[PDB]
Amino acid sequence: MKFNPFVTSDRSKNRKRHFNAPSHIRRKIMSSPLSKELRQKYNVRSMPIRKDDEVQVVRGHYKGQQIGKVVQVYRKKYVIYIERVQREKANGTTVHVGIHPSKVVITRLKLDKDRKKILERKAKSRQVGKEKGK
Amino acid sequence: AKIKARDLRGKKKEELLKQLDDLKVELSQLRVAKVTGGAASKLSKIRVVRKSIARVLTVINQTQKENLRKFYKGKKYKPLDLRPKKTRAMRRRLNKHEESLKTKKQQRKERLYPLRKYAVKA
Amino acid sequence: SSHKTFRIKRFLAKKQKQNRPIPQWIWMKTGNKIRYNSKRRHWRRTKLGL
Amino acid sequence: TKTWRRWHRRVNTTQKRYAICSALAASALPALVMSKGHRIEEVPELPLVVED
Amino acid sequence: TKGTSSFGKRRNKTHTLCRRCGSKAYHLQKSTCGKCGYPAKRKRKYNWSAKAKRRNTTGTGRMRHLKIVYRRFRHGFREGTTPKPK
Amino acid sequence: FIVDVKANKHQIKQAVKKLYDIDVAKVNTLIRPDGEKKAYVRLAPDYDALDVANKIGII
Amino acid sequence: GRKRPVPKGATYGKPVHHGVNQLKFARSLQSVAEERAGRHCGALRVLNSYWVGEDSTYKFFEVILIDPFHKAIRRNPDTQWITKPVHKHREMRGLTSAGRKSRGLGKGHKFHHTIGGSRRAAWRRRNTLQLHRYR
RNA sequence: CGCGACCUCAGAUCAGACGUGGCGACCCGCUGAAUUUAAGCAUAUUAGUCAGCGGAGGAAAAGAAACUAACCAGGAUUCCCUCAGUAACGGCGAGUGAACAGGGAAGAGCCCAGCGCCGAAUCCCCGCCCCGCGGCGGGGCGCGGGAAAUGUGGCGUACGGAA
RNA sequence: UAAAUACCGGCACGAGACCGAUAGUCAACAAGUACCGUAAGGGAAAGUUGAAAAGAACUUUGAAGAGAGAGUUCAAGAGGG
RNA sequence: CGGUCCUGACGUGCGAAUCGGUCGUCCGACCUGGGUAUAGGGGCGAAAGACUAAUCGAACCAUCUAGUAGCUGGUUCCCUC
RNA sequence: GGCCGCUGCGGUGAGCCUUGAAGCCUAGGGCGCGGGCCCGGGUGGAGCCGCCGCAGGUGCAGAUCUUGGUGGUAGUAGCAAAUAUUCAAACGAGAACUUUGAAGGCCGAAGUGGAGAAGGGUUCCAUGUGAACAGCAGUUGAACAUGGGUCAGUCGGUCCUGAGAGAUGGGCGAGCGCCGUUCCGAAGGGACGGGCGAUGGCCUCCGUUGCCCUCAGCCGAUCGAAAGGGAGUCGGGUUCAGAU
RNA sequence: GACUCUUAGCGGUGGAUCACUCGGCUCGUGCGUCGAUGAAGAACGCAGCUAGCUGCGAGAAUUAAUGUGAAUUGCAGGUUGAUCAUCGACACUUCGAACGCACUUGCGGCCCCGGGUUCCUCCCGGGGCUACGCCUGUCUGAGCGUCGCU
Ligand SMILES: [Mg+2]
Ligand SMILES: [Mg+2]
Ligand SMILES: [Mg+2]
Ligand SMILES: [Mg+2]
Ligand SMILES: [Mg+2]
Ligand SMILES: [Mg+2]
Ligand SMILES: [Mg+2]
Ligand SMILES: [Mg+2]
Ligand SMILES: [Mg+2]
Ligand SMILES: [Mg+2]
Ligand SMILES: [Mg+2]
Ligand SMILES: [Mg+2]
Ligand SMILES: [Mg+2]
Ligand SMILES: [Mg+2]
Ligand SMILES: [Mg+2]
Ligand SMILES: [Mg+2]
Ligand SMILES: [Mg+2]
Ligand SMILES: [Mg+2]
Ligand SMILES: [Mg+2]
Ligand SMILES: [Mg+2]
Ligand SMILES: [Mg+2]
Ligand SMILES: [Mg+2]
Ligand SMILES: [Mg+2]
Ligand SMILES: [Mg+2]
Ligand SMILES: [Mg+2]
Ligand SMILES: [Mg+2]
Ligand SMILES: [Mg+2]
Ligand SMILES: [Mg+2]
Ligand SMILES: [Mg+2]
Ligand SMILES: [Mg+2]
Ligand SMILES: [Mg+2]
Ligand SMILES: [Mg+2]
Ligand SMILES: [Mg+2]
Ligand SMILES: [Mg+2]
Ligand SMILES: [Mg+2]
Ligand SMILES: [Mg+2]
Ligand SMILES: [Mg+2]
Ligand SMILES: [Mg+2]
Ligand SMILES: [Mg+2]
Ligand SMILES: [Mg+2]
Ligand SMILES: [Mg+2]
Ligand SMILES: [Mg+2]
Ligand SMILES: [Mg+2]
Ligand SMILES: [Mg+2]
Ligand SMILES: [Mg+2]
Ligand SMILES: [Mg+2]
Ligand SMILES: [Mg+2]
Ligand SMILES: [Mg+2]
Ligand SMILES: [Mg+2]
Ligand SMILES: [Mg+2]
Ligand SMILES: [Mg+2]
């Protein structure tokens, strides 16, 4: 149950906020879970998706075990494009099929200084939380 | 290359002006190319040149106004631009010193009868 | 009339500028509901006031 | 509709306490509890009391 | 000649656009605005027309200064200071 | 040329002289029905309008 | 006195409201004087006024005004109360002595129709249906 | 005749400030109807209400008795319950209509003029120097300039005060 | 001269035994908009493809709108009001 | 410039006052554009209660107002007594 | 009296539901005196219901009811004011209407001609199209879409005042404000010239100057005419659309 | 056989019902802030392709700074920080209480600069001023107003 008297349970308000969130909030919404091995080796459960990460598709018509590289993150439509998840149009052109990041599992992150800083921050937060809990 | 603003603070007004004039000439050439029919590359560079103009002008203005504030810092009368622009009511309100100064009679009253700290047994 | 004032000429210029159909490349946006310009104005039919 | 419709009601304290007593008395009968629908079949004793 | 025939003699106007409110209600011979009373210092506003009151009030325009005023009040009208440089 | 509505013939002549380093004989101006102010700038007889257009970039 | 500004003495209504001649103004002539003095002197603030003369057709008063932004007034702790914005145009709202005289306010059983802030306040308190949640 | 004071009154693009207009849910001051009810209608009612005008604030107004009471007396203002649809008003018809005491929310008191006594002991402004400076203030120096005796400041205000 | 007091405007909020596109604000949408009146002013109608445009390549009759085949889709018995 | 008669045409018209023939006046109390003044119990009227934006024996717009009506119209499922 | 019906809330049905909810159609099977209800078939694609209580903006055939849609009339009334068309060719998928040539006609210089004022505001010009509009049709358009086009010392506004409107002073007014236009105003910021003091130019002589001396009426600020008053441009050529 | 009626199947016209809801309505809470340093409101302009809506102001779908940290997207285009959010520096067209006089965007005056002149006057461009009322102080004044000296 929610006890904070300054956040809503209003369905309409939550939908409006989600569909009108600015880009830097779209980034936070567009988060995907790391694989089992990455999760074990980083102590971090999820990471906002980036443009050049290897991922897998877990649900839908394109689910499988193949490793695909993200092509572009289309924040306006809340979908991401992978390098070989695509269908065939009528004329013969191949266009990409959008997939929600919540149905995708990250396989190998694109590391830079800021990404590493995010990972270490999340790891430290989970460590302090576990110390408090136990 | 990419004209930024960090590398312009340390410069001097004359080369700032000459860079601005060169940028304006480039923008004029781009607009001529646009009206005659040119390349989408130049059409896209038009906005880049416009933003470069904007940032050069704002750096010039900021440096000039900070220098002028330093000039008028010690003076008692200064331009309305350099006066603080709060709301009208907050400009008309009594200032901090004179809304706190008090009469000798009631200050003597306060010093003779200070409000004490006391407790009452249950 | 041929005898105009600067203000009335400028107003007519603006109305003429805004009397225009929509470009088709807006029709392909994501959240677009516009299908045509519903604020058109034909000189014979609507007389613009004034 | 108006905002000054009589929304709230008033009940005497004596009969409010009467109702509380009646509810507590009914909550100690296995027939009444099972009729209300609780799965109390394996419960050892219906006035279930546990230590502090 | 009471109707159709007499409608043809209407060729010169009685109202033009006024400088203050931009509505075609500036009487030319009177030199007064029918909607806002432009020559008068005070805005023309009446309590028997709520629709007219709400058609052009503070909520209808651009709010150029007053929205910035609200934004600055949210922080208390700070001046002279800048955020801590990196 | 197309100039802004606040320009007069003296300013237009001086601006053309400054920007293009040419001599100006006379200036005709009108305001188009669109709102922009067109300018007809005639040059001194010893300059060549074809050459000026070539250098400015219109042809 | 004050006569009713009605065209040609034609009050379209009931006979009770037909009079236009023998009517009187609610406020006093001293209050009217202070009002127009302050109205002309917009930047100044009116304190009080007194009586200096009268003839058949005129009365004369002297209104005491204070400039609120003079520092000799701003820096005095016993008379800087007049600089507060709440005292802006006292004579317009009937806060000066002459304005208060015609408001019928004061202690006692004679001023029962003013108990509260003012006459309007008393009327509003009395003419309101208090509807409690439980009544 | 001229010169010098004071008094009343002028002109300044004189130095420095201030007001104007907007919104108007709530508030203060004026002005103020008629539909309607009375089974007609004129007093009355609608109603000090709508319309109209002016003036503010974050609240406004009120406010520390020229009070209530007739008791073994209470003790500024404002708000809630009750007093009470009561006393009273009313072609005594229709209708209208408080306050005191009691219980609570809050709770805070003060200042002048005047009579007096203190060498005007009082205040504003311009200049330099030192500091502070986005609420223009503190200190030192001017045989610097004004306001003020047609009355500034200190003590002092009905609970008494002064020596 | 603060407090207890008032608040259908304004800046943020939270909730509801409320209405659910002829309802609820006139206005769920480019609504005080289109439009009407010389003017004061008056003032609407108008939501929904699909999970994803995958929005029908190509063949053919016709000048063309428009059809017959082929194809997408789970469904065109969802073909751009 | 006006509008007699045919009481003609039309009379869901070409037209919310038009058409045809026939008619009155045509140097004057003449016809007319633009500017200007007079505003609603008011204007203006060679006077018909005429005209005052298709509205005049008291214009138009918003509000008081959801004005009152002893008077017309309507008033939503079943069975049983 | 309703185990008649509608919407929402509190409890209850280990209720129903993508192996298919609501809704809709049904020559299907039934129940109830009735209000109505339950099954079967089809369509549809995401929610719904029974019992115990609670609440209500809770049940339509009518109101010259409101909004929206659709009929008969009806392929009907009508597309009849102002004399009138014809032959051939071209483009074109397609010609009674477009264009060109020829013929026959009308307006008849108070015009069905050539140009302006008010008003309209891009309708003006070229190309392209023929979805919609032009009450038949269109190869056409004042339609639609792309693009172009209005050049001034000597045309006019700009200036003046007219009938009139309108500030300051003043008066009145609770007040927004109103009256008033020379009337209860210290209503001139100008100058022939002389002197005084400062300045630049070969400080010659003059100019820019601050003061004194001297001289001095405005009918009242200001607005008010694209037909009134008001100096000054004509000839030839030029575009697709502009020419003093 | 035509036409007419009823019924059912299918297909039309039409948008009822059902289900949805970035919208309202009501209640409650905190704050409770405009303007001559130019407000509310109006007009006109600004995007590579842009009409409306939105944002903005000749620096014109924004500059600077802070935070976040790899995008925007309908089509093109070219990590020492793209985009968003915040917003404290800068900037902010013409009207509008609206301010030189009028409201055509017409006509001025004073001062200082750069063209001209080589200040000698014109003329051009730019910048700063030029409203009403009122308070304090300053300067210049007025009066057969009350005086004093000569
Ligand atoms: Mg929390
Ligand atoms: Mg004292
Ligand atoms: Mg027309
Ligand atoms: Mg007129
Ligand atoms: Mg007002
Ligand atoms: Mg009366
Ligand atoms: Mg009264
Ligand atoms: Mg008080
Ligand atoms: Mg008295
Ligand atoms: Mg000054
Ligand atoms: Mg005000
Ligand atoms: Mg009656
Ligand atoms: Mg009756
Ligand atoms: Mg009657
Ligand atoms: Mg009466
Ligand atoms: Mg009364
Ligand atoms: Mg009122
Ligand atoms: Mg305020
Ligand atoms: Mg107060
Ligand atoms: Mg006392
Ligand atoms: Mg009783
Ligand atoms: Mg009464
Ligand atoms: Mg009491
Ligand atoms: Mg207490
Ligand atoms: Mg004293
Ligand atoms: Mg709650
Ligand atoms: Mg609908
Ligand atoms: Mg609706
Ligand atoms: Mg519906
Ligand atoms: Mg419905
Ligand atoms: Mg639909
Ligand atoms: Mg949907
Ligand atoms: Mg289906
Ligand atoms: Mg379907
Ligand atoms: Mg007749
Ligand atoms: Mg007839
Ligand atoms: Mg007939
Ligand atoms: Mg009259
Ligand atoms: Mg006559
Ligand atoms: Mg008669
Ligand atoms: Mg009338
Ligand atoms: Mg009625
Ligand atoms: Mg009867
Ligand atoms: Mg669905
Ligand atoms: Mg309901
Ligand atoms: Mg019906
Ligand atoms: Mg026929
Ligand atoms: Mg015909
Ligand atoms: Mg003939
Ligand atoms: Mg012609
Ligand atoms: Mg002609």
Ligand SMILES: [Mg+2]
């Ligand atoms: Mg043409």
Ligand SMILES: [Mg+2]
């Ligand atoms: Mg046709």
Ligand SMILES: [Mg+2]
């Ligand atoms: Mg010439």
Ligand SMILES: [Mg+2]
């Ligand atoms: Mg003039």
Ligand SMILES: [Mg+2]
């Ligand atoms: Mg006047």
Ligand SMILES: [Mg+2]
């Ligand atoms: Mg003229």
Ligand SMILES: [Mg+2]
């Ligand atoms: Mg003329």
Ligand SMILES: [Mg+2]
């Ligand atoms: Mg059937």
Ligand SMILES: [Mg+2]
């Ligand atoms: Mg529909």
Ligand SMILES: [Mg+2]
């Ligand atoms: Mg539909």
Ligand SMILES: [Mg+2]
């Ligand atoms: Mg644009």
Ligand SMILES: [Mg+2]
């Ligand atoms: Mg930036």
Ligand SMILES: [Mg+2]
């Ligand atoms: Mg950054």
Ligand SMILES: [Mg+2]
């Ligand atoms: Mg004029």
Ligand SMILES: [Zn+2]
């Ligand atoms: Zn106006």
